Amino acid sequence: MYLRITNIVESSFFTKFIIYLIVLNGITMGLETSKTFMQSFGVYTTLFNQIVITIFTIEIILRIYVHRISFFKDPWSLFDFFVVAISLVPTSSGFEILRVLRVLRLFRLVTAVPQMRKIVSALISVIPGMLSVIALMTLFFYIFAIMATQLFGERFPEWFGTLGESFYTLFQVMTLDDWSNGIVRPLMEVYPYAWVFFIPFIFVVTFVMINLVVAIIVD
Amino acid sequence: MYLRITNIVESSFFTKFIIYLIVLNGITMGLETSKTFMQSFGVYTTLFNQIVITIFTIEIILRIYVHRISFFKDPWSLFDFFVVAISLVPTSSGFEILRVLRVLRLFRLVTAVPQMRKIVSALISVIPGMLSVIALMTLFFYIFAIMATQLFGERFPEWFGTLGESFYTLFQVMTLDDWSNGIVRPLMEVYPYAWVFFIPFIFVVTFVMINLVVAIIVD
Amino acid sequence: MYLRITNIVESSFFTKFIIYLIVLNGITMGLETSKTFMQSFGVYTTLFNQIVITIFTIEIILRIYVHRISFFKDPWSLFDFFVVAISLVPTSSGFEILRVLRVLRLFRLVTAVPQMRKIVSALISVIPGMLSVIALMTLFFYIFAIMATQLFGERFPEWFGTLGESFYTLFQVMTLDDWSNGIVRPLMEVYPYAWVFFIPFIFVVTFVMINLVVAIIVD
Amino acid sequence: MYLRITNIVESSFFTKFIIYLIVLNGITMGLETSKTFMQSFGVYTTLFNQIVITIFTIEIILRIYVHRISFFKDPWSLFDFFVVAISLVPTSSGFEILRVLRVLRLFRLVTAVPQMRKIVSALISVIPGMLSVIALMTLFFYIFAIMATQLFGERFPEWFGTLGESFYTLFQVMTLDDWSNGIVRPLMEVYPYAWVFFIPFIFVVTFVMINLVVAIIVD
Ligand SMILES: COc1ccc(CCN(C)CCC[C@](C#N)(c2ccccc2Br)C(C)C)cc1OC
Ligand SMILES: [Ca+2]
Ligand SMILES: [Ca+2]
Ligand SMILES: [Ca+2]
């Protein structure tokens, strides 16, 4: 009974059938943001959403039947599973973010449509080499998050009152977002010398990113 | 009678002549932005323009006999066509904006100088390779924009009330422009976990971008 | 019994563990950020803090007896030395800014983990190459800061009132932080030609940067 | 006479002495930043200045004899000539800006130090191969600056009343500086489609720039 379906899955028609559905649901999903649309035609779309979700679930099972254990070591396939499984919990008691997460299902376009997968693959592939600098930056940020909560969090709770807040604010400055008129000049009206931790924090932070990118190019 | 024209149109005087006209027009088009200039010299310029549009109009018709079906298979020539074209379409009819669109005709200086066109060509030529990254990034933006409108549009209709607006703000965060104190910090005052939405978004979008340059460089 | 003591601190059991105390101190220090936590658990960590500082002190002393003159020509241990020493400076010198500098010893995880060291050292190696770039820039900065102070200082004391202040604003404009709406537009209301100063400045600082990166790549 | 004068100017003593003098006049002008310093030592620094311009006028004179007409074919010296010459034009009456342009003489540290000469010349060296893109981009800016003024200049004069104003504003958007909340969102409150102008625009300027940098790198 294996042989019957295995021929169905590998067909030009199975894949193209799934892909045409995704691009369709993605067009559907666009229209789902207009509440006005959701009046005049709202009923069609909860249905369409239930149908596609059913089809995909069936479709994942056959592929596991066909691929067995070789399915759960293909990351692209694992993602489609995790992206499909996610899309199935009822949106009531569970966080209502999952009603919003189900648009991730459009990322199935990447997994099933070639060219798209490689680019993601090329990109993911620079990540393991970098994990160390990522560990560095995170330890670095953390040492500085601690310093900032203690140095400025008393008088400036919105920016530095909590360790998590300190991370964020600190993150903004690295992204160079309104950082001087916005955060430190305020800081200097009380702390004339905050530039001693924000001007160098900025140098380091800039220095590493630039050197990281450079290190990508050489490699 | 068909045989006579080709030797005129192809001459190095022809090409030298048209480029001169573009530069004079471009000087005059600068002048048209000045009000003072207009009372004082308005009427010379409004008429100079239609003489130039005809001369260009004459050149294109002529160029089509010599180059035949292959005229319209030339991308450089097609631009030439539509740009003088748009300067021919009447004012009240269609839009009113295209009257002002006319300034685009200074871009003929690019079409007609071999040195400019090759840079442009070289520039255009990285793109067929980018069409994967454009496609990929457009798909990614689309997906987060849908999530953002539904997450954030009822309480912030100005910013996310709508898909377009959702796109717009997301392009903006991507350019890192006042992204935090100006969009996300406010957001965070009603929706605290918005940093989970935008800080990841920021990483992804700036990462994809950086790596795009490396493969441009290497290739 | 020399080599026996030497046997001890060079062991893999000792270091990973004291690395683990770093990881441990790193955790409690995050915890010290909470006023809630500090209230009902303050003595656990006021306690946890004293043991660790002591342990680190014996290690530094010991590693010296093992290495002697060699200890003090190792850049990573001098760092190690100085950041424990700082913690051996008491609570107050009026400047209780030092009690905050204590959390600097968490950079010891960098000194203590060879894979960390590899990354930092790679990063440093970039710098000497740029010492030439650094002097030219600091000079241009020095002069223009002077022109700025004299030019804008009387009417705009916050921004340019002072050599140091013009330095800060100039650094800000160089990071391209709200440079237009935030500084130059206001200035031109009093001094309409200020664009003749700052756009050239921007031009140079952007330019040199770009060029800075290119040098890094080749090096 | 000729050879006797010619042999002191070319010496390691002459130029070291001038460099030594330049560093003081640079240190001296920073002190002139402090009106505090000026009411307490201003008489010391007002003539230290005065004899330095004397010495430099003389130094310049000697160097002219040694190199004759070939002096005015040297970029660094012609620079030295005018940059000192400027400080000799009388402050009073005709114009008072000329007093501040006098500070440019501190740029001679570059002129007189060969490492500095090496750096600058290297920098200038990348410019000739960039000019063509300067031409295209400047031509693009010139086209859109015309457009922004006719399109947005009526209702928004501060930003677009004048070409220079559209240039400056486009340059800002180019510098990507507070462009959405600061510029285009307001435009959009009257002209909802203003983004069809500005969003493509940002794509272009960012694209050309990267590829400009990239073109630099590979060679
Ligand atoms: C995420 O961390 C970052 C932290 C910091 C920066 C530098 C940001 N930059 C100052 C903003 C625009 C500046 C730029 C130049 N200058 C530019 C970009 C696009 C168009 C024109 C220009 Br003039 C360019 C080199 C990124 C980038 C980061 O990611 C890319
Ligand atoms: Ca920025
Ligand atoms: Ca900014
Ligand atoms: Ca800003």
D118-137 burial by CB neighbour count: b if 16+ within 10 A, else e?
A: ebeeeeeeeeeeeeebebbb
Distance B173 CA to ligand 2 centre (A): 10
Residues 6+ apart with CB under 8 A from D80: D60, D63, D108, D111
Q: Which residues of A are less than 8 Å from C177 in CB distance? A: 176, 178-182
Closest of D167, D162, D164 to residue D144, by C-alpha? D167
Residue A215's CB: how many other CB atoms inside 10 A? 20
Domains (range + CATH), chain A: 1-114 (1.20.120.350), 115-219 (1.10.287.70)
Judged by a CB distance cut-off of 8 A, whether residue B137 touches chain A is no
* Terminal Cα distance for chain D, rounded: 50
Task: Compute, in degrees rounded to 10, the torsion defined by CA atoms B152, B153, B158, B159.
Answer: 40
Pair D152, D174: CB distance under 8 Å:
no
Q: How far apart are the first and last CA of chain C?
A: 49
Nearest to A4 by CA among A66, A67, A70: A66
DSSP string, chain D: -HHHHHHHHTSHHHHHHHHHHHHHHHHHHHHTT-HHHHHHHHHHHHHHHHHHHHHHHHHHHHHHHHHGGGGGG-HHHHHHHHHHHGGGS-SSSS-STHHHHGGGGGGHHHHH-HHHHHHHHHHHHTSTTTHHHHHHHHHHHHHHHHHHHHHHTTT-HHHHSSHHHHHHHHHHHHTTTT-IIIIIHHHHHH-TTTHHHHHHHHHHHHHHHHHHHHHHHH-
Query: What are the chain D neighbours of B30 within 8 Å (beta carbons)?
Result: 142, 146, 163
Angle, helices D114-125/C127-152, rounded to nearest 10 degrees = 90
CA distance linking residue C90 with residue B9, whole number of Å: 89
> Would you say how long chain D is, in residues?
219
CB D79 within 8 A of CB D72: no
Listed in sequence order, the DSSP H helices in A107-162 are 108-112, 116-124, 127-152, 157-160
Q: Which residues of D touch C173 (CB under 8 A)?
A: none
Q: Is A115 left (phi over 0), alpha (psi -120 to 50) or beta?
A: left
Q: Name residues whose C-beta falls within 8 Å of residue C194's C-beta, 6 or more positions apart in sequence.
A: C151, C152, C184, C187, C188
CB-based contact (8 Å) between B41 and chain D?
A: no
Angle (nearest 5°) at CA C175 between C174 and C179: 70
The technique is X-ray
Q: Are B85 and B100 in contact (CB under 8 A)?
A: no
CB C149 within 8 A of CB C166: yes
Distance CA B46, CA B52 (A): 11
- CA pair distance B47, B54, nearest whole angstrom: 11
Query: Which candidate from B116, B176, B217 shows the least CB-CB separation from D217?
Result: B217
Rounded to 5°, angle at Cα C39 from C37 and C42: 75
Chain CA centroid to CA D197, Å: 32
Q: What is the resolution of this structure in A?
A: 3.2
Q: Do C103 and A143 touch (CB under 8 A)?
A: yes
Extract the tokens encoding D121.
């010349």
CA C23 – CA B153 distance, rounded (Å) = 42
Residues contacting residue B71 through CB under 8 Å, at least 6 positions apart: B63, B64, B77
- Give the largest Cα separation in chain B, rounded: 77
Q: Which of C146, C208, C210 sits opposite D29 (nearest CB)?
A: C146
Determine if ligand 1 sits within 6 Å of the CB of residue D211: no
Give which of A33, A14, D10 is closest to B142, Cα–Cα.
A33
Residues 6+ apart with CB under 8 A from D158: D165
Structure tokens at A171: 């993150």
Residue A111 in tokens: 């997994």
d(CA C110, CA C117): 6
Q: Which residue of D has its CA nearest to C147?
A: D100
